[PDB]
Specification:
The complex is a heterotrimer of chains A (826), B (326) and C (248).
Chain A lengths: L3 E7 L6 E5 L8 E6 L2 E7 L4 E8 L4 E7 L8 E6 L3 E10 L2 E11 L13 E4 L5 E5 L4 E6 L10 E4 L4 E7 L7 E8 L2 E10 L4 E4 L5 E3 L5 E4 L7 E4 L4 E5 L2 E5 L2 H4 L3 E6 L6 E6 L3 E11 L5 E13 L5 E6 L2 E5 L5 E6 L10 E7 L5 E7 L8 E6 L6 E7 L3 E7 L3 E8 L4 E12 L5 E3 L10 E4 L19 E11 L5 E6 L4 E9 L8 E8 L9 E10 L2 E10 L3 E7 L2 E6 L2 E7 L5 E7 L5 E7 L2 E6 L4 E7 L4 E7 L6 E6 L4 E6 L3 E7 L6 H4 L2 E8 L4 E6 L15 E8 L4 E6 L2 H17 L8 H4 L2 E2 L4 E2 L4 E3 H4 L7 H8 L3 E2 L7 E2 L2 H11 L4
Parallel strand pairs in A: 1-62, 38-40
Antiparallel strand pairs in A: 1-59, 2-3, 3-4, 4-5, 6-7, 7-8, 8-9, 10-11, 11-12, 12-13, 14-15, 15-16, 16-17, 16-18, 19-20, 20-21, 21-22, 23-24, 24-25, 25-26, 27-28, 28-29, 29-30, 31-32, 32-33, 33-34, 35-36, 36-37, 36-39, 39-40, 41-42, 42-43, 43-44, 45-46, 46-47, 47-48, 49-50, 50-51, 51-52, 53-54, ...
Chain B lengths: L12 E8 L6 E6 L5 E7 L10 H10 L10 E6 L14 E6 L3 E2 H6 L7 H20 L2 E2 L8 E3 L5 E3 L6 E2 L20 H4 L8 H16 L9 H12 L29 H4 L5 H10 L10 H5 L20 H4 L1
Antiparallel strand pairs in B: 1-2, 2-3, 3-5, 4-5, 6-8, 7-10, 8-9
Helix pairs in contact in B: 3-5
Chain C lengths: L15 H4 L4 H21 L4 H17 L7 H15 L6 H11 L2 H4 L6 H15 L9 H9 L6 H18 L10 H15 L17 H4 L5 H17 L7
The chains are: A mainly beta (826), B alpha+beta (326), C mainly alpha (248).
The structure holds ligand RQU.
Ligand RQU sits at the interface of chains B and A.
């Protein structure tokens, strides 16, 4: 068996959802911000936000909504996790003591159902009579909000429309009514139903179905003064309400897809809209009052306000202040002004909250020769693209290098006192027949620049037609100085050439240090690329020189230096190249039992291959023969997102289901089959998507640091900005810490009353197993924050073993010291 | 000639790797040196010398040289390790069952979650599987181990049945006692959970229905670790075993012994309301508690869901692409 | 695709056993002993008639590719029965076959099994499988005797006498090389023909074509009477030489 320990070094920073309301007091205006597994509660002031409380939940927050049922003084909070844990929460404060009450809870998972394409949707009735959940295709789940439903028991209503895009409860209806957009072979439609809690079924809805835009994406429920709904698409915005129908199709929105909406005026007069290029719009409902005294909707208007960060959630707070919740870039507070500034913008940034964004790749480098190590991360996407330099000093110090294009891979080249970074920017087919960039970015603002003139694929004779307005990716290699972080050079790869892999190393007997990039020719027609290049660059005297190129018949997904040779994965093949005295790459040996060799890692003459579906394989280079040999395969099926080698026997992997596992050589030489079998000895639901595993540590090493119980250091980056650390433990220390977890879980009160053991259970849609071989260090590190009565309760009847003390009792002061040492690994 | 098996050597194949672990010996992927065709060589080890050549292999060598169908896997030949020269007693070399190499298996395509099945694709998957099963059932053979890992798939969309290790002949006239609890618990029929030991070909049908549902839900329908627990889950959806629905349930050994918590009513149509009507009927008939009332393979093929499916329009499933990895 | 398991009578002059100096009478004596050994061992173990026959067919085929003087007849027989049990799903443990073989064989005969009987047998399984070219499925005259008899309608007691007498002729033919000369379908007809001539029955009337004097044809196409007579002659010769006489 294997024993390992996982801790968070940086909590998730990306904003997954944000709501406003009156949650902490019936008087205050709150802002609840949801980051993965994290809930942040703020109070709105005239300058900004006053933090009041933050809690963690044992689950990914999928639904977050505030509501106030009749009889309550203040809003209650509904949360549903991605594993379908539902709960209703209440804020309670006793002087200085703040706690979160679990008023109702339960797990709403169905034994049989198909998870929907557009994900979990949760909505609440305007009269707070019920919670609507869209969890499975063809089903609508209703949790009725009666006082007695403390277990959140629910029933399903059969839904004929199998493919639902979005649904909202409507305002101004005689019965609870849902309005939704759905898709069938004839296009997309908008339709309504009434929900009867008494009959537990749908009844005919208030207004007829209407055919809507093919890419109708969001349903805005309009308030009582107007009633009805608004449907947002790619080209048009429409208003529907019985006999009333409006449609505005302003050309400005066609340019970028709109992803978020909010209400600025409680009466529905004004809504806020945002798009994937960062633009912020105001949607205006122009009123017309009839002599009847009734109020109708006259027209819709869209007005461009300015630019914000690409925002997952918008929420208007008060006065001119809007909170911009960003998942791809840094989140913001911005103020909307009545008068535009001299550039024509009504939006002026106030504060900028740090979001490590998606961490596509990262490396650890000791820039200042301190023995510490700093983390340079490829963070963000598109306009929010950034390099983030992270050091420890008690908080983490983070520096941001704006790139305004997407960073993909990073590698450090000490000889040249610089970094190599692969990047891609979006250009659009323009009337010249070429393309034009939406904004200047790192690859365009380099000091010196080059473009590849390779004639490898120039024979072509393969037609690829271009339509005006279509997007294209333009990939580049950036040379960036390690002190100034100024773009020194930019190399633009071939048209339709995507850069996938990057290494910096010396090869063979060649004393020069090179940047080597693996690329793939990508055309929309191909399911899998069939052409590629491995390019050898030398950065010298401010210029990048192309030393050699090797053509491959696939995509160079991953490369890694292997004892003076270049190990590259080209689609199904894993290949080892030698670097000749003529400065050309030469094939030596190959491996072909791979579906798609996405990830590669080396230790000694051992190689770890990460396949798309068939999990990890431990190849070995056999120098006596000049070829590879299969040491062992993980026969169980897991889709990989990143892999890493822990030691000569243990291997770490990440699943696309937010799961981690550790494979080991079965170390039993009885039968050849046992050695060729890797047994998954560690299982752990991380709750985050691991993109990059990287050996190193951010802790300052003065050589005086007490040797911690933990051995080894792997940092990992995730899509939500969370940075974590994996390390190994001795059998004794694991048993101690594991036994302590079980004691801590009985003592610590979970928000939503979610069992910790369930949360960390390895969970795929088709398999769910208990966690094994992993210590949730974030649980262990919470021992230091629980009250003294609880600490002593935990240590009762705790014994040590496998050491000088075969049986040794623990006291609350002993464990405080142990955990405090465990907090010093990050 | 092509028919003299057991003499050609495994030298003729370049071994590519290991594709799986075997109940009797490990399976390797390989390329034929002469033709370039990709094969999958199963290792058959007689070195144990406990009962000699495994009977499981003997059933795969006996049945698969009889069964010819587009939906049943092909045993191309049997090849051997370099045999010891003129010393059969010292010889402990092993034998290999050469099969066609099928690109993917259903367990891996659904478990990675990368596969997306449309209705028409499911029709083509099921139509082939049932046609294969019908061929086998008509020849009076019972697979007895239908599983998602045993339904191999080529990228073209061709499906082939695969693991004939537990297969045996069925005699309608003579109810000879066979082994028991043959299919894996998740895909096991209710009768074998109650232990009939005189089983009908309808055992394989139950499994295929379980697969039909799993293709729509992307999650196996009846997942349990204990035989009674499986009966409960099946009982909740398909209804509790009771004399009205299963007149002969009282004759089954464990009917009094193994009981569901309640006498649950059948809810299949309700819980599978999202499944198309043509298919939902097929599931109700395939997942029928009484083996005598459970539909046959031919009946499944003469179906509104499957009858008018044309095997010419294979329509490959949405298998992973490079953008899908992205 | 599939191998040819049938030879011409003239070809049996050129088996490995013959060419190593064994005369025709001895090889046929050795075949009867080995087949009867297989039959007697398996009958003591309670084995189905198909299992006994499958072993005997393996045995006969084996000594068309191998010699009798270099490969012992009783070890081979035991090995054949052992494999037959696994093929026909009537399995037996090798130790039990040895036990029974010892019970039935004298000390000289059991000397063939050598110092370690189980080992000599289990080792041979490799050669057997390669020799029979892994063609394990075998059809036997029994199933056709019943399939064809089921289509006869008439006096219940005259047909049941025909069947049993023919069934006995099938059991007897296993001692001969007929299994190597004619498909099982022909054998079943030949034994129906032989029993009919002896019982002075006219099988043509029991058929659906009472007037089709060549009734074998509605069961087995392209079978000349010349074939059926050759088979009858070979079966009847066994009764002539032995003390056993026609059952009737
Ligand atoms: C320990 O247990 C397991 C648990 C889960 C998953 C797998 C196993 C092993 C037993 N699985 C097996 O052995 C799989 N049977 C299988 N798969 C075939 N082609 C599909 C296939 C399956 C697997 C891979 C593959 C490649 C690399 C890595 C992993 N898998 C590739 C193609 C195939 N063609 C012909 N035959 C005949 C010899 C029966 C085949 N048998």
């Amino acid at each position: 068996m294997s024993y390992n320990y996982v801790v968070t070094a940086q909590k998730p920073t990306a904003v997954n959802g944000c709501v406003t309301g009156h949650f902490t007091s019936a008087e205050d205006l709150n802002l609840l911000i949801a980051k993965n597994t994290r809930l942040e509660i703020y109070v709105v002031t005239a300058e900004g936000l006053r933090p009041v409380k933050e809690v963690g939940m044992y689950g990914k927050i999928a639904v977050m909504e505030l509501f106030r049922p009749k009889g309550e003084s203040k809003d209650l909070l509904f949360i549903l996790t991605a594993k379908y844990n539902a709960c209703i929460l209440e804020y309670k404060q006793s002087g200085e003591s703040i706690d979160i009450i679990t008023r109702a809870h339960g797990n709403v998972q169905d034994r049989i159902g198909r998870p929907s394409e557009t994900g979990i949707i949760g909505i609440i009735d305007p009269e707070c009579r019920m919670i609507g959940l869209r969890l499975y295709d063809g089903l609508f789940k209703v949790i009725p909000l009666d006082r007695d439903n403390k277990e959140l028991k629910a029933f399903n209503i059969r839904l004929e429309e199998l493919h639902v895009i979005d649904v909202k409860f409507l305002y101004g209806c005689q019965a609870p009514t849902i309005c939704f957009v759905y898709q069938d072979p004839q296009g997309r439609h908008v339709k309504t139903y009434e929900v009867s809690l008494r009959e537990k079924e749908f009844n005919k809805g208030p207004w007829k179905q209407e055919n809507v835009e093919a890419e109708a994406s969001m349903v805005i429920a309009v308030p009582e003064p107007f009633g009805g709904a608004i449907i947002i698409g790619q080209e048009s915005i429409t208003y529907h309400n019985g006999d009333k129908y409006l449609a505005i199709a302003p050309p400005i929105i066609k340019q970028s897809t709109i992803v978020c909406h909010n209400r600025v005026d409680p009466n529905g007069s004004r809504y806020l809209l945002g798009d994937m290029e960062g633009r912020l719009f105001m949607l205006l409902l122009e009123k017309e009052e009839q002599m009847d005294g009734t109020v109708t909707l006259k027209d819709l208007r869209v007005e461009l306000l300015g630019e914000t960060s690409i925002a997952e959630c918008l929420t208007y707070l008060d006065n001119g202040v809007v909170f911009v919740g960003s998942r791809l870039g840094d989140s913001q507070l911005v103020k909307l002004n009545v008068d535009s500034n001299e550039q024509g913008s009504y939006v002026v940034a106030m504060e900028t909250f740090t979001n490590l964004g998606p961490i596509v790749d990262m490396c650890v480098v000791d820039l200042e020769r301190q023995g510490q190590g700093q983390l340079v991360t490829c963070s963000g996407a598109f306009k929010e693209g950034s390099l983030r330099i992270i050091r420890n000093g008690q908080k983490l110090h983070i520096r941001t290098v704006p790139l305004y294009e997407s960073p993909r891979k990073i590698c450090y080249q000490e000889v040249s006192q610089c970094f190599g970074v692969l990047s891609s920017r979006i250009e659009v087919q323009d009337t010249s027949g070429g393309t034009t960039a939406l904004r200047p970015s790192a690859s365009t603002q380099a000091l010196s620049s080059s473009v590849s003139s390779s004639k490898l694929f120039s024979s072509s004779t393969a037609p690829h037609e271009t339509s005006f307005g279509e997007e294209v990716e333009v990939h580049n290699l950036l040379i960036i100085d390690q002190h100034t972080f100024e773009v020194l050079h930019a190399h633009q790869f071939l048209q339709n050439e995507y850069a996938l892999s990057l290494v910096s190393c010396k090869l063979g007997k060649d004393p020069n240090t090179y940047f080597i990039v693996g690329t793939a020719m990508v055309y929309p027609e191909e399911a899998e690329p069939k052409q590629g290049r491995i390019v050898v660059f030398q950065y010298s005297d401010g210029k990048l020189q192309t030393v050699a190129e090797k053509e491959v018949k696939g995509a160079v997904y991953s490369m890694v230096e292997f004892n003076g040779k270049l190990l590259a994965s080209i689609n199904s093949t894993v290949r080892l190249y030698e670097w000749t005295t003529e400065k050309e790459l030469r094939t030596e040996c190959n491996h072909y039992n791979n579906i798609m060799a996405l990830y590669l890692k080396t230790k000694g003459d051992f190689i770890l291959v990460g396949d798309l579906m068939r999990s990890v394989l431990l190849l070995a280079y056999k120098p006596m023969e000049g070829n590879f040999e299969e040491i062992a395969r993980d026969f169980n099926p897991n889709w990989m997102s990143a892999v890493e080698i822990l030691d000569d026997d243990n291997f770490l992997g990440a699943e696309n289901a937010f799961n981690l596992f550790v494979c080991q050589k079965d170390s039993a030489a009885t039968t050849d089959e046992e050695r060729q079998h890797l047994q998954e000895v560690g299982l752990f639901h991380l709750g985050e998507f691991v993109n990059v595993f990287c050996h190193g540590s951010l802790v300052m090493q003065n050589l005086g640091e007490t040797s911690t119980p933990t051995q080894g250091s792997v940092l990992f980056g995730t899509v939500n900005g969370m940075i974590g650390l994996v390390t190994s433990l001795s059998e004794s220390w694991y048993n101690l810490l594991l036994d302590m977890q079980n004691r801590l879980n009985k003592v610590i009160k979970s928000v939503g009353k979610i069992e910790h053991s369930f949360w960390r259970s390895f969970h795929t849609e088709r398999k769910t197993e208990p966690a094994t071989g992993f210590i949730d260090g974030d649980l262990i590190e919470s021992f230091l924050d629980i009250s003294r009565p609880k600490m002593q309760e935990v240590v009762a009847n705790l014994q040590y073993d496998d050491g000088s003390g075969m049986k040794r009792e623990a006291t609350a002061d002993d464990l405080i010291k142990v955990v405090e040492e465990l907090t010093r690994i990050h | 000639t092509e028919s003299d098996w057991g003499k050609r050597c495994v030298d003729k194949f370049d071994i590519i790797g290991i594709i799986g672990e075997g109940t009797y010996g490990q399976v390797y992927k390989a390329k034929d040196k002469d033709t370039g065709e990709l094969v999958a060589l199963k290792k058959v080890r007689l070195d144990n010398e406990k009962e000699g050549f495994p009977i499981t292999a003997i059933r795969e060598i006996k049945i698969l040289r009889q069964l010819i169908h587009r939906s049943v896997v092909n045993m191309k030949e049997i090849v051997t390790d370099k045999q010891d020269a003129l010393d059969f007693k010292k010889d402990k070399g092993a034998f290999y069952l050469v099969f066609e190499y099928m690109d993917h298996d259903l367990m891996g395509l659904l478990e990675s979650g990368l596969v997306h099945f449309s209705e028409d694709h499911i029709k083509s998957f099921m139509k082939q599987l049932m046609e294969g099963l019908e061929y086998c059932h008509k020849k009076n053979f019972l697979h007895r181990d239908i599983k998602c890992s045993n339904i191999l798939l080529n990228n073209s969309g061709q499906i082939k049945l695969a693991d004939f290790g537990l297969a045996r002949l069925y005699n309608s006239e003579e109810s000879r006692p066979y082994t028991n609890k043959v299919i894996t618990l998740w895909y096991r029929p209710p009768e074998l959970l109650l232990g009939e030991e005189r089983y009908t070909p309808a055992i394989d049908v139950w499994s295929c229905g379980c697969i039909l549902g799993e293709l729509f839900t992307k999650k196996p329908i009846f997942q349990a670790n204990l035989e009674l627990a499986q009966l409960e889950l099946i009982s909740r959806l398909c209804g509790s075993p009771c004399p009205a629905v299963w007149p002969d349930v009282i004759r089954l050994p464990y009917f009094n012994t193994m009981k569901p918590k309640k006498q649950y009513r059948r809810r299949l149509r309700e819980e599978f309301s999202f499944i198309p009507s043509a298919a939902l009927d097929l599931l109700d008939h395939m997942l029928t508690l009484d083996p005598s009332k459970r539909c046959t393979a031919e009946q499944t093929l003469q179906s509104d869901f499957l009858k008018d499916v044309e095997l010419s329009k294979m329509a490959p499933p949405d298998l992973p692409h490079w953008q899908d990895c992205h | 695709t599939k191998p040819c398991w049938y030879w011409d009578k003239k070809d049996l002059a050129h088996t490995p056993s013959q060419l190593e100096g064994l005369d025709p009478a001895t090889e046929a004596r050795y075949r009867r002993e080995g087949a009867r050994f297989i039959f007697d061992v398996g009958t003591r173990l309670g084995l189905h008639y198909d299992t006994l026959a499958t072993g005997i067919i393996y045995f006969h085929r084996f000594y068309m590719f191998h010699s009798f003087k270099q490969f012992p007849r009783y070890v081979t027989g035991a090995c054949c029965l052992f494999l037959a049990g696994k093929v026909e799903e009537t399995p037996k443990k090798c130790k039990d076959i040895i036990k029974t073989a010892r019970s039935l064989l004298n000390d000289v005969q059991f000397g063939q099994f050598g110092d370690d009987p189980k080992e000599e047998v289990m080792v041979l399984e490799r050669i057997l499988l390669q020799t029979i070219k892994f063609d394990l499925q075998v059809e036997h005259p029994y199933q056709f005797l019943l399939k064809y008899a089921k289509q006869l309608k008439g006096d219940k007691n005259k047909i049941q006498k025909l069947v049993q007498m023919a069934w006995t002729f099938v059991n007897d033919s296993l001692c001969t090389t007929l299994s190597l000369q004619w498909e099982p379908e022909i054998i079943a007809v030949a034994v129906m023909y032989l029993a009919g001539r002896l019982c002075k029955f006219e099988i043509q009337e029991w058929t659906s074509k009472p007037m089709y004097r060549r009734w074998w044809e509605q069961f087995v196409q392209d079978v000349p009477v010349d074939v059926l007579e050759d088979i009858c002659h070979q079966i009847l010769d066994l009764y002539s030489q032995g003390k056993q006489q026609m059952p009737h």
